[PDB]
Structure formats: C-alpha cells, structure tokens
Design a protein around this ligand. Structure first.
Ligand SMILES: O[C@H](CNC1CCCC1)Cn1c2ccccc2c2ccccc21
Ligand SMILES: O[C@H](CNC1CCCC1)Cn1c2ccccc2c2ccccc21
Ligand SMILES: O[C@H](CNC1CCCC1)Cn1c2ccccc2c2ccccc21
Ligand SMILES: O[C@H](CNC1CCCC1)Cn1c2ccccc2c2ccccc21
Ligand SMILES: O[C@H](CNC1CCCC1)Cn1c2ccccc2c2ccccc21
Ligand SMILES: O[C@H](CNC1CCCC1)Cn1c2ccccc2c2ccccc21
Ligand code: NA
Ligand code: NA
Ligand code: NA
Ligand code: NA
Ligand code: NA
Ligand code: NA
Lengths: 232, 232, 232, 232, 232, 232
C-alpha cells in the first residue's frame, strides 16, 4: 500500500482528480454515477469515481505545497498519467475576475519550497496543454464562462508586516489568481512525466457561487471522463 | 469563528498541543481525564483536553509547513501563549538515535518557504527555553530517556535525483532529526510572541514503540498541564 | 521611429515572426508571396511579409537574451499582439530528439538575466496556448512530425570548466531542447499582454535538414497567417 | 602552539570565557582570585583565570565575525567544551531594553559570512540550553535583573545609505539586541560539538553602567566556575 | 573556421578592437590606413585593420551580454591576447559626465547572467591595467579630456515598473556610466588570460559629439596600435 | 575623537598605510625616519610615520572583514584620501607564486558579508589604478620582482568539511592569492571616494622572507610617500 494515501498501485487510475478538502471528495463522489470509498488517512481521502462510463480517482491532498507533494508523489510514482486539481483561489485582478468566477490555469508562480528542492528555480511550473484544452472545451460545451491565466502558488496565506508580499507585483505582471498548490503539482508532474492541469473558483481577493461551484465541478468531472477515455 | 480551525477565540486556551494527524488528536483526547470535541474542518481537528486539573486544546495542523502555518497563525493571532508540537521524525544520527527514541528539540533548520516569506533567512528558528526545559523535566520525572538537538524541518519528504538533499550535510552539522513543521512553528511563534516547543519520536531514518509513543504523549501532556497552570 | 528597429509604430503588424539571424529574414521573405523591406539597423532587420492573403512582419532579434529583449520590448510596446519565434536549438534528449527534428515549445527555463530584472524568478516563462495550438495544427495539416516540450533558454553557449552547466540537470527534468531567447520572449510577452510562441529545429546536441528547415518555416509562416487573419 | 592564539592545547581549559577587547581580559583577570598570563598575539590575548576554586581561560577574540572565527575554531578544535561570550550590544527594543541592561541570548541572526561558508543559511544559530540556564541562574542568585532574547549578529557596524539595514526588520521580528559575533560562535560551536552562550550589556541603540558591567562580569564569571566544576 | 565569427584562427591578431554595431566596423575600417574585409555572419562582422604600421582585427559583437560572449569566447579561445571594447554608454553622473564625454573604464558591475554561469558572483569584473593605462595615455597625447570609472553592465535596456532598477543605487555607489557588455568581456578575459579594456562615449542618461566620437575612435585605434607593437 | 581608532580627524593624514597586526605597526614605525605614537584601542593601533619628507598614518585594522570595516569607515569618513593595505596572503598558484613572493593586487573576490550589506554583489571590488601603478613603480625602482593579480578576500580561514571552499574554483579562474580584507577595503573606498590599493607577501598555500618582508615594507612606505607628496 502507498505509505500515506493507504491505497494500492492497482487502485490508481490513469486519471486522478485532486482537491484540497477531504470533505469536497465526499461532495464530489455523490454527484458521480456511483463510487467506491477506498481509504482515508490523515487529510488524504481517496474515492473511485464512476462518471459517463469512465472511472477515475478523486483524492484530497490537504492544504499547502509540502503536504500536497506527498500526495502527488505517491500518485505519480505509482501509475497516474493525468492529474487535474480543482480548488479555490483568490482574484489578483479584482476589477475583471470576480467572486464565483472560474479560472483554468496553464502555469504557476513557484512561491513554494519543495519545487525548488526538486529542480532549480529557473524551471517553469507549467501545465499540460491537452489537459488545459480539455478543461476549456468541457466548459464551452456546458456554456460556462471561464478565465485563463497564471496562478500564484504561495506558501503564505496569512502575511505579516515585515516582508512585503509579492502578490501586488505578480498582479502587475498579469497573474490571474492566487492559491497554494498548483505550481507544486505542475513541477512534480513535469519531473515524473505526468500530465497536469488546474481549474479554480474565486472565493476572495487579497486586495481591497453554489451554482458556479457546481459548474466548476461538472467541468472538472467532464474533463476527467474525456481524458480517462483515452487510457481505457 | 477562526476561518479554518472553525473555533472561537473564547475556546482558545493559553496552552495548545499540536499534532499533524487528526487521528492522533482522537488518540490523545481519550487518555486525558475528559475532553470536549470542538470542531473538525479539513485536516484541522480541535478538542479541549482536561488533564491533571488543567485544560488545553489539542489541534491537528496537517502535513507540511504551508498547511500548518494556517493553523499556527490562527492560534497565535487569537490568544495562544504556548504551543507544543508532538510528532514523528526521522533519525539523522542512526548510530545514536534509534527507532522509538524521543527527541526534544530547541531549534530547527528552516528548509520551508513560509518562514522566509515572513522574515529573512538569517533569522533563527528557535524554541522557547522554558517550554524546552518543561518537556525535559517531565521526561526526567517519568524516568523516560530522551535526546535533545536540532531538527531539520524539510518541505521535501520524497526526494528526486536531480538536486541533492541536504540531509547528509545537516547530519554532519550535528542536526539530530528531520521532520516537516517545527521550524515554521518556531518562527511564527517568535514573530507573534508565542512560546513554542517540540517533542518528537523517531519512526525511520532517511539513510541506510507503542510504549515509546505512550511515553512521549505522557511527556507532552505532562508539560502542557505544567505550563497551563501558570496561566490559569 | 522605434529607437533600434528603425521602423514606425504604423508599420507594426499584429502578428510578428521573429528569428535570430538577419540573413534568415532574407531567406524567409522570398518564400512568401511578396514582401516590403522596411529597415536594417545593427542585427535588427525588419521586412513586411505577404502570405496567404495576410501580412505580418518578420524581424531579426540577434543572438542572446539581452539583445533580443531590445527587439521584443520595442514590438510589444508599439502594437504587436502575437510574436512567434522560429529558430534553432540543441537536443536535450538525444536518443529521442534528433538532428533536424522540430520542436514546438510551450514554456522555458529562465537561465537569462533580463527576465529576472523584470519579474521575480518564481514567475513562469510560458507561451500562449492558442499560439502553441496554432503551430501544432499547421504542422499536422502539412503532415510534418513535431515534438513538444520545454526549452532551456541559456545565456551561456560556450561553457567553462569551473561552474557545472545545468543542462544535464534540466535534461533529467525532461526539458526537450536548449536555445537562448525563448524564455525572455515569453516573460516580456506575459508582462506586456502579448501572445508568444516558439518553434525550433534541432541542429546539434550539447552532450555526446534543408527539407526539415523548409518544413519548419512553412509551419511558422502558416501559423502567422492563421493568427493574422483574426486581427485583420 | 595554536597558530594565532599562541597557546598550547594543554593550556586549553574545558570552559573558556571570550570577550572582544584584549583590554577587557586584563580588567576581568584582576577580579578573579588569581590568574596566569598566557599569550598576547594580534588582538588575541589569553589568560588563565582562577575563580571560586575553578580555572578557565579568558581569551579576547577581536572585533567582527571573520576575526573571532579564527579564535573560536582554534579553541573548539583543541579541547574547549564550553565557550561563553561576554560583550556589549545595542538595544533593538529601546522602550523596554535600556542602556546598561543585561541580555542573556539563546539564539542569533546570522548576518555574517563565515557561518554561511560553514553550513547552509537555513541552519539556526542557537546556543546551548544548559549554558543559557546557568547564566540565568547565576543572575537570579546575585539578584541581577536580566532580559532574554535573540541577538542580531551583523558584520556592518557603520551603515551606508544605499542598501537599507535590516535592523528595523529584526526589531519588528522581536530580536532583542544587536552585536557582531554571537551567531558565528553559535554555528561554530554546534558544528564542533562545543556548548556556547552569550551575555551582553547594552551600550547604545541603533535607532532614535559601571555597576551594571561589574554585575554582568560577575554573572559571566559565576557561570564559568559552575560549568567548569562539571569537567574538573 | 570559428563557428560564428566565420574566420580562421590564423586571421586572429593579438589585438582585437570590438564594437557592438557591424556598421561601426565599416566606419572604423575606412579611417585606418588600409583594411581587409574578412567575414560577416549574423551581427558578427570582422575586418583586419592596418594602422600606424600595425595590424589588428575590428569585430562587431552585437547587442547584449549573451550575444557578445559568443564573439569574445571565440576570440579568446583562438589566439587573442588583448581585447578593447569601444562603444556607447549612458551617464550615471549627469551633473559631471555629459553627452559626448568619453569614459575609460577599469571595472564593471556584473548585471548579466553569462558571467555568473562562468564564475561565482563574488568575482570582480575588472580590466587589465596596462590596457587601461594605454587608453589613458593615448587620450593625453591627443589632448582629449576623458573620465575614468566603473561601468554598470546591465542586460535590461528597457525597464518595467515592477522591479526597481538598480541604476540609482549604483550611481550613489559612484559608478560612472551604464552599458551592456563590458563586465562580460572582463570576466571572460580574466578566465581565459586575455587582457581587456573599455572606452565609451556618453549618448544619454537613464535619469532626468561627431567630433567626440572621432576622438574616441582615434584613442581606441591609437591604443590598439601601441599594444599590437608589443606582440609583433 | 573617532569612536574606535581613538584619534581626531585633525590627526588623519591624506595617505594611510593599514596593516592587520598592531605589532606590525611597531615594526614599521621604527624603519621610518621618525614617528609619533597616537593611540592604541582594541586591535586598532595608530602611529604617524615620517618618511622621505612626508607624513602618513600607519594603522592596524585587525583580522577579518567586519573588524577592518570599522577601521576603514572611520578613516574614509574623516579625511583619508588614499589607503594602502600591506599584509600577508596565501598563494592560489603554488607552481608560479611561492613563499615570500610579493603580489600587488588590483581587484578582489568579495567573499565577505559587510561589502554586500553596503552594495549589491554584482558590484566590483576594485582598487585605484594610480595607487596600483605607484606600488608597481616603487618596486621596479627598488629592483624588487613582484606579481600582479586578483585576491580572494575570504571570511573563512579554517574550512570545515560540509560546504566546499571556493578557493580551487577561484584558482582555476586565475585569482592569484587569498587573504581576508582587501575586497572590503576596496568597496568601502569606492563608496566613500577613497583611493585604495593592496600589496601582499605570500606566507603559505591553502593547497598541497625576512628579506622579502623588508622589501615589501619598503615598497609600501615608498608608495605612501610618493602619494602623500601630491596632497601636501
Ligand atoms: O481562498 C484561497 C485559499 N484557500 C486555502 C486557504 C486555506 C485552506 C484553503 C485562495 N487565497 C489565497 C491563497 C494563498 C495566499 C493568499 C490567498 C487568499 C487571500 C484572499 C482570498 C483568497 C486567497
Ligand atoms: O517520518 C517522518 C515524516 N512524517 C510525515 C511524513 C508524511 C506524514 C507524516 C519524518 N521523516 C521525514 C521528514 C521530512 C523529510 C524526510 C523524512 C523521513 C525519511 C525517513 C524516515 C522518516 C522521515
Ligand atoms: O545551436 C543552437 C545555438 N544557436 C545559437 C548559438 C549562437 C548563434 C545561434 C542551440 N544550442 C545551444 C544554445 C544555448 C546553449 C548551448 C547550445 C548548444 C549546444 C550544442 C548544440 C546546439 C546548441
Ligand atoms: O556597541 C556594540 C558594538 N560594539 C562593537 C562595535 C565595534 C567594537 C565593539 C553594539 N552595536 C552594534 C553592533 C553591530 C551593528 C550596529 C551596532 C550598534 C549601533 C548602536 C549602538 C550599539 C551598536
Ligand atoms: O545608450 C547605450 C545603450 N546602447 C545600446 C542600447 C541598444 C543598442 C545599443 C547606453 N545606455 C544603457 C545601457 C543599458 C541600460 C540602459 C541604458 C541607457 C539609458 C539611457 C541612455 C543610455 C543608456
Ligand atoms: O596567511 C594568510 C592569513 N593571514 C591571516 C590569517 C589569521 C591572521 C592573519 C593568508 N591565508 C588565508 C586567508 C584566508 C583564508 C585562507 C588562507 C590561507 C591558507 C593557507 C595559507 C595562507 C592563507
Ligand atoms: Na496539509
Ligand atoms: Na509547504
Ligand atoms: Na545580439
Ligand atoms: Na544576455
Ligand atoms: Na578583528
Ligand atoms: Na567578518
């Protein structure tokens, strides 16, 4: 069994949908056609989802880059071929990207540590195009407006007042949103030959919805099934 | 209510015992005299422990520095005065520090990112002496052998083969153990005027027990009650 | 007139094809339907290309990141909306990617300086998806096999023996090819809201063709015309 | 003979008191019960002190981290087991820590270079607890009020106006005092398995006494004798 | 033949005058006594100059550090013994150093990347004294007033508004002028045992002539002939 | 009075000769024509030397960059115009530069901290040419063979075995010698508009004489008198 996910390599599907909150797994699994509870250890909850004729895991990775890296490494080193993260984010363009808006991200700022412990900082955190394109196409098909851009992946949710946050810098650099895991997923995926992507819903802004969440989940599930079809 | 711990500032005790696994909270709370379940959100589980006439929270912080920082910031900014982490670690001195051995750590290597987003890297991750001294004294009283030293707090649990891990370097520098949160707790505590400490049990070695865990938990609970007495 | 390109903002087309060698501009312009020589100053040669009913500039940017940044900034700050770089590269996967092979790159390693003088190193050098997708589709249409991957953009062509080159590190990290400008183009484009892309032909390997070049040029010209159609 | 201290390894006592000024050695040695002048080379003056039945060296280390490292390395590599630095410092909390106040420090900011040439910057500069506890206890016994905290060890005494000093940053981070050697002593001690500590008297503030110095010296001498007793 | 300069090692003279613009080579070669056109590839134009009885190449290196490094490495690894750069620069002391003024520089700020890929950043970018002295003496002989100082060699000509430029910092540090190649030439020369120097004419200021250019060219040619005499 | 040198600004001569050891001041002052003892505080000993009709201070600066910076800042901010360091060094080219050989250095590697706390690391540590030329000319006049090159100024005299020393790297980069202060003197001098230089005698090699010292001192004194003549 995987040391922390507590599942076997035989239970790892080619496509895996990852989310941060173990509770969101339970909310996702009930909107699939059926499911099989697999394991629940620490913040890592794993369920096998059945959707549109296809099967793919949904696994929670917990909050933050170092914790999610444990999850992602165990999946990538044991059979996963596609990992899509669905999660929440904050808007770095509050005049254009509002609460409830959905963003499909192709790349990320590596404001973590574990990616730098894996490869030099000059290396890009970048998603797989085919995964990005699949998420965009599933949204168009469901007639759900979405934004596209770069996510700032930061290990600091609560800032202090001594070292200035770089969020305003990255906003001026046209980063779209902020969250805490995407860049780690992307680097690990690139290093391990796993195709990755990310779809995120805005729930706040670091500067001065149920319908949207349902839509984002449908997009994420729709894309997982489309990609899973290729590997079946 | 605190955004992620989902408890109120009135429920925050002066002393808090933190652990990584929500399950370990449940294992700890039943060996106290009594307890009050408070909240469970994401990987953050909070319980009020009653032990030796005193009361103190036990809260899980999840795996990894960025995730535990969310927990620690919410406690430090809302009334906590003492935070002791009890957890697991790997031995960096396998000829001297063996599986099951217990280490009480006074300082830590800042191989994370969030501490660096809070204060310059030259700043030390260091625990409070009185907390360190209390944990040592509780162990002596229970006649439980312990080691003392520096912990390497690393955001990388699974290494890759491109960038060498610094664990051997830090072993040669006489670091005792490795784990993934202590340095983050220490810096946040220093910045926020919260006294911190750490007690850890060895469960592996990155290089070439139930009785010990019970002992470590007794030491941690013993020290929490001693410190809580001062604030009551 | 632009200070170094020596053309006017009115002569800047929405789509620009950039190459390193002023001579390659002359080789490209004669395979278009017609052309208009615009300017030639330093290594910056500018020609207006007419191809498949569309018009777009072809401009040389010279060798190396600091020199090409002068070219790219003048285009991005004066009307350019799409910049595609067509150039040469070295294979970082010599068993899979051979001399003459063509690579369409979505992202790049920022081993330059000017990108870091513009934005923090954690920021990704990433291309525009629509541009990447257009280059891939034009190749499929012409039945020309291509590879896709990350380029290492390095300011050091001739290494010395004191500081080890990171090329082997990035090869192990699954970077596909090496060249000297793509990452600079990508960051400048992201900062300036300009869509960028890159198509490259392998002409060597840092470790132990005319038909292919013609094909790569046809792909690059084909994609420029397709994108130019949108802005006309 | 040691290359720069000009004493023999047989003259090295288990406990050594270090100070910056060779003159302070002469002021310290005359308040002991008796003494033996050993050597004086460059700024390194060594005397054997006899106090409360015990013997321990008092050695000057000069101004600044690179110069004191020569002194500390020669002691640690030739028999020293405990090194206590007694010196002066500036207040980083001028509303709380005033001129003449005494601070016993447990850790330090590594704003030097030599510590970084010895071990990675993430490593903590931290003192030995038993040494820290001994200095605190000797002060309580003599009824001498003291403060405890982190020292900023900076290689820059005279700032210029181009690069901002980090002293205000570290003050906001709750560093207590500033001086120029403690962090270097701590890292060298940790690497060499030597127990270190520091006691400092405030003589200024970087921002907007004889009785206290006598008290601080008594505390330092008192602690040296207590520690020396263990090794005799 | 050299890969990019397209000349043979037999055509490399001991002394080489380098300039950025291929056009400036043509302007320089006609004021010599005679010349021999050698090659023109990319931005690298090479001509053999005959002046005051001596012979030395004049070669263009293009804009920017990464591009000029290709030129400089090919010369230094194939016989060159002295390389003098003559070029343009911006004044960092606008009250003292005005448009048209000439500066002979002995050292440079390494705001590039390739020098750092060759040797650690602490290493100085410094010119050869004898070359510096020769340029100064040739100016005195021609009664041409000149300034002397440090050049900032920056890879960023067009700044953006997110990361502050260090030009004001270096101006306060008494750097005289800014340009984009000198530091790269100096480090490569030091590493390869080639004597280097730089003479520059002010053509702007980053903050709030034909006679001078002719004078600067005469100085540069005068110094090349003097140095070439030693090797003939 | 200057805070640490304990002399007045009126006692500061335009030319100052600095050495590390207070004892070397006493050895130097007796070979001048006459002298005036000024002050002795900590490792800072100041004497007014009379030589060949001129007067100039000789001041000891102690061991190491942070300590000598205190000395150099007090001189540069209070009237000094020329500072020459005479000292010892280790050979980084043991096959060419042997024990007793004398090296006159024009630039230095900034392996310190205080220079970096004053100005960004890309800035060169470089000496004044006129000072360098004067030292070379005084040696030629006395028929004393000398070498010229770059010094590595390192804060680490005693290396440990965890982090590799860069001395071999810098030797391969053609650095001539190693010592511990020159780079700090050069940066401080450049920032403060003080002309600096360095002359050094080899007394060891980090890898696998009285007549020479007398010669080096004569050269240093000879150059001080020549420079002092200009300011009198
Ligand atoms: O809300 C998610 C954060 N979700 C996680 C936080 C803890 C568990 C789930 C996005 N987000 C940020 C991510 C990183 C740093 C700062 C922010 C931020 C600021 C304002 C609004 C949203 C923000
Ligand atoms: O076992 C804990 C790790 N516990 C956490 C891991 C995930 C959840 C709980 C200590 N530990 C390490 C911490 C950091 C990096 C490497 C190691 C390591 C290697 C071997 C043995 C123990 C090790
Ligand atoms: O050939 C292009 C380089 N083209 C430019 C070089 C000068 C003008 C045109 C790709 N390339 C590299 C780019 C960067 C660093 C190293 C290499 C490299 C090594 C071997 C083979 C190809 C290589
Ligand atoms: O006074 C000691 C400094 N003692 C040494 C200085 C030279 C010899 C002895 C503490 N101190 C500082 C140490 C570091 C950097 C700045 C300061 C500082 C500023 C104001 C007041 C005190 C200060
Ligand atoms: O003009 C040369 C630049 N020449 C080159 C530029 C492109 C081809 C030739 C000096 N220069 C700068 C060099 C670096 C960065 C900024 C500046 C700058 C700013 C104002 C005035 C002059 C300046
Ligand atoms: O001897 C002087 C050092 N003098 C000072 C040392 C303490 C007081 C005086 C040159 N030197 C080095 C300077 C820096 C780092 C390493 C070395 C080194 C190694 C071997 C031989 C000479 C060496
Ligand atoms: Na977590
Ligand atoms: Na983390
Ligand atoms: Na160029
Ligand atoms: Na460049
Ligand atoms: Na000193
Ligand atoms: Na120092």
């Amino acid at each position: 069994l995987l040391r922390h996910l507590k599942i076997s390599k035989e239970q790892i599907t080619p496509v895996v949908l990852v989310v941060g909150d173990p509770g969101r797994v339970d909310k996702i699994k009930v909107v699939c056609d059926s499911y099989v509870d697999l394991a629940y250890n620490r913040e890592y909850k794993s369920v096998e989802c059945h959707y549109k004729g296809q099967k793919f895991l949904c696994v929670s990775h917990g909050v933050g880059s170092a914790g999610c890296a444990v999850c992602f490494e165990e999946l990538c080193q044991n059979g996963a071929k596609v990992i899509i993260r669905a999660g929440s984010c904050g808007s770095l363009q509050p005049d254009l990207i509002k609460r409830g808006d959905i963003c499909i991200c192709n790349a990320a700022v590596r404001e973590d540590r574990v990616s730098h412990l894996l490869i030099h900082g000059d290396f890009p955190a970048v998603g797989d195009f085919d995964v990005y394109d699949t998420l965009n196409k599933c949204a168009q098909e469901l007639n759900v407006p979405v934004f596209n851009g770069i996510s700032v992946s930061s290990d600091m949710y609560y800032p202090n007042k001594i070292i200035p946050s770089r969020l305003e810098d990255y906003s001026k650099a046209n980063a779209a949103v902020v969250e805490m895991e995407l860049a780690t997923l992307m680097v690990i995926g690139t290093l391990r030959k796993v195709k990755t992507g990310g779809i995120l819903i805005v729930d706040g802004c670091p500067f001065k919805v149920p319908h949207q969440l349902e839509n984002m989940i449908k997009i994420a599930l729709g894309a997982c099934a489309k990609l899973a079809t290729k590997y079946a």
